[PDB]
Write a protein that binds this ligand. Structure first.
Ligand SMILES: *[C@@H]1O[C@H](CO)[C@@H](O)[C@H](O)[C@H]1NC(C)=O
Ligand SMILES: *[C@@H]1O[C@H](CO)[C@@H](O)[C@H](O)[C@H]1NC(C)=O
Ligand SMILES: *[C@@H]1O[C@H](CO)[C@@H](O)[C@H](O)[C@H]1NC(C)=O
Ligand SMILES: *[C@@H]1O[C@H](CO)[C@@H](O)[C@H](O)[C@H]1NC(C)=O
Ligand SMILES: *[C@@H]1O[C@H](CO)[C@@H](O)[C@H](O)[C@H]1NC(C)=O
Lengths: 157, 142, 253, 253
């Protein structure tokens, strides 16, 4: 009855604040509601804003355009329709799974990860050092030498 | 008189790793087809693939390649009734193979902040120990 | 009189899903007795399209015979015979066209190069070029799209495939999409599609735009946590330096 | 007997500071009665030099007419006609010639283009491409240099000149230097030069070499410098912590 909705490039790998044109090609005429999905959360209504969401109706086609796209806009986009055909047969589109790309030149990511690995190894070493410092210092402060008087393996322990 | 689940709108897979598609439908055992295409309006008709395997109609690419990016929509025929799916999208990304350093940006940067806080505190406390020691040894000498 | 048989191009083969054979006859003094008939090795009758090209400056004519056959027959290296009985030819001429023998296959490796900064500095125009390298069959069709709309062949050129240096049997080609600076300045997404036989799907597509850093990485870095660590570390540096100075002064007193 | 007129070439004009007008006539049965001389449109006779080559294997002789006149008149598009008469010619073959149609004559605009990072990702080979576009004359000679030495044609390949869209009568060409992966690591000097008639210095060359020429972009590296200064500050903080630890240990010890 009302299941002839069309869509456009779905994956749409884009950089932050880029431009693509959406539409809602259909073979019917009725009430329309844009919806946005992120992750597994429930469908939610979209709110129009000038220069951020452009809504021009080309007759049976409902053009859409999203500027200033950020990471919060990652998810699935589609346009609903209302089919008041005495049976509440409510149909929907299929989807447009937008993605936001990390610009790490696909190469600096390796350098950053290697650096953080260095720093948390430095954590291991320094934290061991600063946990052995207080006890070995209060032993001298309170007043090691006794153990030596009482071999290399014991010293390591 | 019938519907079909659209499946994932997009899909990701590592290069050289198997990618399996899907076509879920309410039919009993009804005719299924794979019609590969491209993103937008090109000058070529959709390229039909093989017939799939199993009752579901699942594709299989044992060694996928970079050339396999594009839509993969499944065609279902059920007693002279036609219905079009939506279409997936294969793609390769070659992710990061280095899991040693506690995978998760938030994880590593959070433990970095914890590094700063704990290192500063565990350096400050030795200062208190040192001043206490100095006072006690000065008392000892006197 | 030299006669040749020409297989159809890949573009028409994929467009019509029906190959068109060619029976090219040249150096014809007369055309009233010209008759091009197409058939297979088994002798099955087939319709033949007859068309005459413009006369050459030397006075010689030309003609070609077009027969519609399925592409699967060409894939099965099926043989076809074109029979020509001309008054200038002492005897009828029998020839056969079929698929060439087995040859190494290699799908093309598409690469789309964005215009150089120096080229943009003259603010005149931009030539977007996508390099297609490493395909054994020379039958490759390269097109370009603007916002998903087909671009006429008068707006771009595609060099005929030339053998790949350092690797015999492989061919490479270029395609230059000369675009006005105003059109490229609007952040347009420009793509070239490569239809080619050796491709696993027979067609691919590559994209490039103003971004030029269109690496696919989903979301890994750039979170506000990086700013959080930077600020908390600035504070950490300040406190560490102050602590060290106070330690030195408490050593003093 | 066919009479052909050969316009003078610029090479000897650059070297010998003079232009040679050649009236090459072939298919000559006999030469003992031949009378070939140079002339002008206004009937002014010219000094004609007769030079005859050896017999052609087809049984026909040949002759030439050589004249030397100032280049400036030839640059002024003066119509010079070569008079050819023979005993076998019912009428003389007077070929009328002048400067061929001069055109906009624009010099090439070379825009060296770097390899695509996707191609480098294969770790196998890279192609350096230098697009040469915007020249009127068909002739053009692209050569690549390695560390100041000419690169032989055995390693690189270049595309033949083709008309460029958007401007009739305007030509362009291309080129590609395949390089191996370890060649691209070493940061060698990849430069391609262009020889052209319209070049005011007669030679031009672009330089995109080593392993990276740089690229300015939008935002993009801001968090990168933030990360670099964060790493520097973690380094300083580590140094201060180590200094404090060593001071404490030495005061204790
Ligand atoms: C709408 O459906 C009718 C009937 O099938 C068809 O003729 C027409 O082309 C369709 N319009 C669109 C935009 O698909
Ligand atoms: C619909 O889109 C076309 C193509 O962009 C445009 O020419 C036309 O004016 C649009 N409809 C309007 C604005 O009435
Ligand atoms: C929508 O239409 C289908 C097909 O007639 C029917 O099976 C389904 O129950 C309908 N849904 C609603 C909400 O009416
Ligand atoms: C459709 O059903 C017929 C039933 O015999 C079968 O032969 C055919 O292969 C089916 N379509 C497919 C699987 O392409
Ligand atoms: C899609 O591409 C075809 C082939 O180039 C073209 O005929 C058609 O007009 C394009 N889109 C539309 C508006 O139908």
């Amino acid at each position: 009855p009302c299941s002839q909705i069309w869509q456009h490039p779905r994956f749409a790998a884009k950089k932050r604040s880029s431009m693509v044109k959406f539409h809602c090609y259909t073979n019917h005429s009725g009430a329309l509601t844009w919806f946005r999905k992120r992750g597994s959360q429930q469908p939610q209504e979209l709110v129009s804003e000038e220069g951020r969401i452009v809504q021009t109706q080309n007759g049976s086609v409902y053009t859409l355009t999203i500027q200033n796209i950020q990471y919060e806009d990652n998810g699935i986009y589609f346009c609903k329709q209302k089919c008041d055909s005495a049976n509440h047969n409510v149909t929907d589109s299929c989807g447009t799974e937008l993605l936001v790309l990390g610009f790490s030149t696909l190469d600096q990511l390796k350098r950053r990860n290697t650096l953080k690995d260095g720093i948390i190894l430095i954590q291991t070493l320094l934290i061991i050092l600063f946990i052995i410092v207080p006890i070995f210092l209060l032993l001298d402060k309170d007043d090691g030498l006794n153990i030596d008087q009482t071999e290399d393996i014991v010293t390591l322990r | 008189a019938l519907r079909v689940e659209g499946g994932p709108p997009s899909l990701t897979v590592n290069l050289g790793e198997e990618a399996r598609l899907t076509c879920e439908n309410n039919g009993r055992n009804p005719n299924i087809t794979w019609w590969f295409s491209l993103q937008s309006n090109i000058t070529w008709p959709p390229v039909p693939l093989g017939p799939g395997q199993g009752t579901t109609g699942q594709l299989f690419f044992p060694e996928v390649n970079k050339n396999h990016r594009g839509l993969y929509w499944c065609q279902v025929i059920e007693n002279n009734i036609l219905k079009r799916s939506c279409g997936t999208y294969l793609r390769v990304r070659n992710p990061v193979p280095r899991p040693f350093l506690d995978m998760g940006e938030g994880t590593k940067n959070r433990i970095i902040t914890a590094e700063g806080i704990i290192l500063l505190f565990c350096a400050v406390v030795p200062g208190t120990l040192l001043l206490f020691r100095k006072r006690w040894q000065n008392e000892k000498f006197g | 009189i030299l006669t040749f048989t020409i297989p159809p191009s890949f573009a028409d083969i994929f467009l019509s899903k029906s190959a068109n054979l060619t029976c090219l006859v040249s150096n014809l003094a007369t055309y009233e007795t010209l008759n091009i008939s197409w058939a297979s090795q088994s002798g099955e009758p087939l319709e033949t399209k007859i068309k005459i090209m413009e006369s050459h400056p030397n006075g010689t004519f030309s003609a070609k015979g077009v027969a519609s056959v399925c592409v699967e027959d060409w894939n099965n290296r099926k043989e076809f015979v074109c029979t020509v009985t001309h008054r200038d030819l002492p005897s009828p001429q029998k020839k056969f066209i079929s698929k060439p023998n087995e040859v190494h296959k290699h799908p093309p490796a598409v690469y789309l190069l964005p215009p150089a900064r120096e080229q943009l500095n003259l603010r005149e125009s931009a030539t977007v070029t996508c390099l297609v390298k490493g395909f054994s069959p020379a039958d490759i069709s390269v097109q370009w799209l603007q916002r998903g709309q087909l671009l006429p062949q008068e707006k771009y050129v595609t060099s005929a495939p030339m053998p790949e240096p350092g690797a015999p049997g492989f061919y490479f080609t270029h395609s230059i999409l000369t675009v006005t600076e105003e059109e490229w300045n609007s952040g347009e997404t420009y793509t070239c599609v490569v239809g080619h036989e050796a491709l696993p799907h027979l067609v691919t597509e590559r994209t490039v735009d103003k971004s030029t850093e269109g690496e696919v990485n989903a979301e890994e870095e750039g979170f506000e946590n990086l700013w959080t660590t930077a600020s908390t570390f600035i504070v950490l540096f300040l406190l560490s330096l102050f602590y060290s100075t106070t330690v030195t002064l408490f050593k003093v007193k």
